[PDB]
Amino acid sequence: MNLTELKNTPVSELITLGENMGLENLARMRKQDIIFAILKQHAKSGEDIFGDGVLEILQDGFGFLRSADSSYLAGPDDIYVSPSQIRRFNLRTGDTISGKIRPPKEGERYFALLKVNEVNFDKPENARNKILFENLTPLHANSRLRMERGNGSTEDLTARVLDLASPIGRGQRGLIVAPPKAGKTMLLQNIAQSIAYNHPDCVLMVLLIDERPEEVTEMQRLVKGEVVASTFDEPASRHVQVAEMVIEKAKRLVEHKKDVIILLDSITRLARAYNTVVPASGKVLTGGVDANALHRPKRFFGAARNVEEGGSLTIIATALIDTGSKMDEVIYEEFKGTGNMELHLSRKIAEKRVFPAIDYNRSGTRKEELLTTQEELQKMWILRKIIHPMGEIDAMEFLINKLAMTKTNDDFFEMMKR
Amino acid sequence: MNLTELKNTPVSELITLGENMGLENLARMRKQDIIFAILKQHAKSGEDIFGDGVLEILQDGFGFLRSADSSYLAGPDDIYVSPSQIRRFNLRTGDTISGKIRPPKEGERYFALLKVNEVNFDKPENARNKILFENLTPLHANSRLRMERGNGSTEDLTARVLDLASPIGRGQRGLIVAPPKAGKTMLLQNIAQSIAYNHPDCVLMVLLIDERPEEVTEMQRLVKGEVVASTFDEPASRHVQVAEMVIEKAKRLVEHKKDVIILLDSITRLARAYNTVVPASGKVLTGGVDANALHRPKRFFGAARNVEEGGSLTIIATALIDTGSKMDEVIYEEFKGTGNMELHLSRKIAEKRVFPAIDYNRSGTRKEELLTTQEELQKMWILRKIIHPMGEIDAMEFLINKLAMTKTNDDFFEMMKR
Amino acid sequence: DTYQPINCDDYDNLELACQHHLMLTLELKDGEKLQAKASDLVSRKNVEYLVVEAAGETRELRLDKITSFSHPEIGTVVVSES
Amino acid sequence: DTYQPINCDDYDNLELACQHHLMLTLELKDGEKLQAKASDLVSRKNVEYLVVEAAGETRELRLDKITSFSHPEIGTVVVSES
Numbered sequence A, B: 001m002n003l004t005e006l007k008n009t010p011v012s013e014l015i016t017l018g019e020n021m022g023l024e025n026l027a028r029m030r031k032q033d034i035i036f037a038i039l040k041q042h043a044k045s046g047e048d049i050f051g052d053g054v055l056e057i058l059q060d061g062f063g064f065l066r067s068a069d070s071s072y073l074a075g076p077d078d079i080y081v082s083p084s085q086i087r088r089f090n091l092r093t094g095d096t097i098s099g100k101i102r103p104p105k106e107g108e109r110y111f112a113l114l115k116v117n118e119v120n121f122d123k124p125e126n127a128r129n130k131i132l133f134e135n136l137t138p139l140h141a142n143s144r145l146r147m148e149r150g151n152g153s154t155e156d157l158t159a160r161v162l163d164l165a166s167p168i169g170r171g172q173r174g175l176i177v178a179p180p181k182a183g184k185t186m187l188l189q190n191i192a193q194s195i196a197y198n199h200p201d202c203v204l205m206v207l208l209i210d211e212r213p214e215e216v217t218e219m220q221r222l223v224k225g226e227v228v229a230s231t232f233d234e235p236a237s238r239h240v241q242v243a244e245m246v247i248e249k250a251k252r253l254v255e256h257k258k259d260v261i262i263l264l265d266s267i268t269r270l271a272r273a274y275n276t277v278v279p280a281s282g283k284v285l286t287g288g289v290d291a292n293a294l295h296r297p298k299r300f301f302g303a304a305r306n307v308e309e310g311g312s313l314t315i316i317a318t319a320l321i322d323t324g325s326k327m328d329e330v331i332y333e334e335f336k337g338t339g340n341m342e343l344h345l346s347r348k349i350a351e352k353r354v355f356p357a358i359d360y361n362r363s364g365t366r367k368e369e370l371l372t373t374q375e376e377l378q379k380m381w382i383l384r385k386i387i388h389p390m391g392e393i394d395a396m397e398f399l400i401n402k403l404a405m406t407k408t409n410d411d412f413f414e415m416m417k418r
Numbered sequence C, D: 001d002t003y004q005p006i007n008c009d010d011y012d013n014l015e016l017a018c019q020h021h022l023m024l025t026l027e028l029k030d031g032e033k034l035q036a037k038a039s040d041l042v043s044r045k046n047v048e049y050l051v052v053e054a055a056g057e058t059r060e061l062r063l064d065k066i067t068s069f070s071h072p073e074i075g076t077v078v079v080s081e082s
C-alpha cells in the first residue's frame, strides 16, 4: 500500500485493517508503531510499498524522511536514506522525496528508500539543477495578497480592516504584536482562510510553537493548507526541530518558483526555545537571554523575501508583549525594526469586546505604494488622515461601523468620499 | 474474603476473626504478619483468596499491584505480577487488576498474582482492545461541571463565585495561582465537595505533594473520592513516583470512556521534586532549575484534555507565588500560558478576612461560550462590565454582598438587572 | 466450546519451559501421551494456543484442553480448570 | 536511448564496493564477464557510470547496462528491471 494514506486513516480504522491482515494486540500502542507493524506484515507479501516525506539530514550524514502529519516527529515509521543517496541525488535537508520503500533488513530498524522518482514534485534530474535559495536576490514586495473575500459576512470584516491598515504582499516580513488577550488566534485563522480562498496557488504553512494540545486540533481542522505544531509539553529541542524543518522546506519550494506563506505563532516562543538549546557564550543580556540565542530566530525571520526570479516567501509571525516576563520584552526589542509590516493589537479595544482589536494608528507597512495601485493609495491616505486624530478605541468602533454598511472596500471608499 | 478488606479491618476485629478460624498465635501486633498467616492457611485448605491493586511496571520487567490506601507505597504486601502475564494481557502502568492471589513461593518475598479476571473494571479480553491515550484527539471543553449547590449555605458562596468568575468544564486544564497565605486548602475542599455531590459519576482524585501528615488526615475524611498524598519528610523520589501513579491511572480510566478529575496541590512542589531527581542537562537557567527538569511536569499538566471519542481528563493544579524563593516564581512563569482556566487568589483580600479571596478582574477561562449557554454568557459579560472598574478588594465585598441574599445565580442575575 | 483462560501460574510454567527450549510431556483430556518439543506460545483470535513440533508436524492446540504437564527437571503440576 | 537509474539499494552495494576495492565479477546484458575492481562512481551528463580497472585501462560503463555482480564476500546481486 501507500504509506501516505496510512498515516491519514483514523487509529480505529487502522486497528480493523491490522486485525484483518493478521496482526493482534496492536490496539494498545502508538499510531507510529501500528503503521510500522502493518507495513512490516505487508512487506512480507512482496508487494511494493510507496512512501514519501521531507528529508532531514542528521549531523552523522544519513537522513530520515519525516511526515507532516505527525509534525515531523521522529518515529519508527520514518524512512531512512543512506548517505550515498544524499550524495547521488544532490539532496539538501527540506527536500520532499517520493518513491518506493523496502522493509528493514537484519540489523536495520527503519524502512529504507528503494527508488526515488519525485523530488520536490519534479523529476529527480531536474530538481538538482535549481539555484540555491541563498543566491537569490531579495526584492521589495510588489504583488498584493488581497485578504478581502467580498462576501460581506461578519468574519470578512477582519480581512477588510486588515487591508486598510497593513496591506500584505508576496514576500512580506510581517509582525503581529499582540497582548495576552486580544483575539490573536482568531486573527491568524481569518488570515489563513482568506489565503486559501483568494490565493489557492500559494503554498500555506501554519507553524505553532508551545501551543496547547486542544488549540492544535482546531487549527488543523480549519486551515486548508498544512499545519505543523509542537505542544508545550514537548522538549525545547523539539520546538527547534520543527521550526528548522518548516523553514528549510519552504526554501526548497521557493527555489522552484513558488509562493510560500508561513504563519508563525509565535516568534517569541521560538526565541525562548532557542535560548534553552543554544549553549551559553558568557554574554547574557537582560532578562536571561543569551546574545547568540537570538541569532537563529532572526535567520528564520530574515528568510522572508520577494525573489527577483520566480517565487516568494512570506512570513507573518506574532510577537507577545505585556506577558509580565522580562525575557519576552527583550525578545520583542530585538525584532522591532526588522519587519516590513507591523500590525499592533490593542488590549483595551479587546476589553471593550470589539473585534478585530487592531491599533490602526500604530500599524502599517513600508513601501506600500508598490502593493497597491495609485488611486487606491490616495484613498487610503485620506482614511488615515481622518483616523489619526481619533483615539485607539474610537477609531476601531468608527471603522467597523462604516465597513458594516458596505460590502466591498471600493464601495466603502466611494461612500466615505461623498 | 480478600486482602483489601483485611487492610482496613480494625486490629481488634481481625484478632477475633483469626482466633475462630483456627489461628494458633495472635498475640503479636504486626498486622502484616498475621494477615499473611491466615492467607497461607486458606491456601492450604484450598479456599479461594482474592486481591486488588494498581499495576506499576518497573524498568526490570515486572511490577507490583500497589494500594491507594498506602499512597501506592512499596510494601511487603504488594502483589507481584510476573513479566509473562504483562506480555500475556496488554498491561500498562496504572491498570487496576483484581483477581485470585497466590501465597508467596519459597524464596519469594511477595505474593504472586494467581489469576486475573477484571482489569480496569472490565473483562480482560475487552480491556486489551482500548485505544491508547496518546492516540486520542484533544478537544476544547464543552460540557461543563456545575458546582453551584442548592443548599445555600455559607460554604456554597465559594462555589457560586467560582462559577461566575471562571467556569470549569470536563477536560479543563485549570490552574490556581495563590500567595503563601490565602486559604488555598479551603478552596480545594469546597471544589472536592462540590464535585462529589454534583457529579457522582466523575472519578475524583486528590493529589497532594509535600503535605504535612495532619492535612492528609483531614483531606481523606472530607473528600469522598480517592485521596493520595506524599508527606514532606519523604524523599523527592517519592513525590515523582506517586505522581506517575496518579496520572497513569487516570489515563487508563479515560481510555474506558470515563471522566476523570484530578486536583493537584501543588504543581510548584511537583516541579521542585522533578528538578532534584533528573540529571543535570549542562545548562541551568535562573533560580537553579534545570531546563529539562520542567519537561516532565508539563507532561503531567498537559495531559488534561477533552477526548473526542469519549470521556475527559480534568486537571486543576495550584501554584504558589511570591513565596520568597525565586525557584517558585520561575516555575510559575513557565506554566503561565499553558492552562485553559486561570484562577487567581489575592493576599490583600485574604488579610481582610474575606473569603474566598479570588481576583475576579484577573481570573477567567478562555472559551466560555462552549461551557455556558448563550443567555448565561451575556449575563456574565454584563456582570464583568460592572466589576471591571472596581478594585480587587472591593469587588469581592460587592460579590459577597449581592450573593448573600440570592439562593441561586439565576436569581442573582434577575436581582442584578434593573 | 468457549475457551477458558488457564491460571497464571499454569501459564508461567509453560512460558518458562518454552522460552529456554525445555522438553514438555503432554497429557490431554482423552489421556494420550505426547512427549515432544514445545517451541513457544501463540495466541490468535483471543485464544491461546501451544505449538509442539512433534517429529516436525508442529501441531497447534488449545491450552484449556491440556489436563496436566510433567517433566523431571522442572516442577510437575496439574492445571486447574476451576 | 534514455538512461534508467538503478535502485537505491543496488547503488549502495556498488558504492561501498568502490570504497573497499572488491574484485567483483561483472556480467553485462550481452553476457560479457570480467573480473575487476571498481575505483569509484562517476556521474556525467545526468548519466551514472562505473569505472573499473579491468586490464589496467580504467574502462567506463553505464549502470543500467550491468545485469549482475557478485563477490566472495557479498552474495550475488541482481539489479531490477525498474
Ligand SMILES: Nc1ncnc2c1ncn2[C@@H]1O[C@H](COP(=O)(O)OP(=O)(O)O)[C@@H](O)[C@H]1O
Residues within 6 Å of the ligand: A158, A180, A181, A182, A183, A184, A185, A186, A187, A355, A356, B366, B367, B368
Ligand atoms: N473576530 C472575532 N469575533 C468574535 N470574537 C472574537 C474575535 N476575535 C477574538 N474573539 C474573542 O476573543 C477571544 C480570544 O481568544 P483566542 O484568539 O483564541 O486566544 P488569543 O487571544 O490568546 O489568541 C476568543 O474567546 C473570542 O471569543
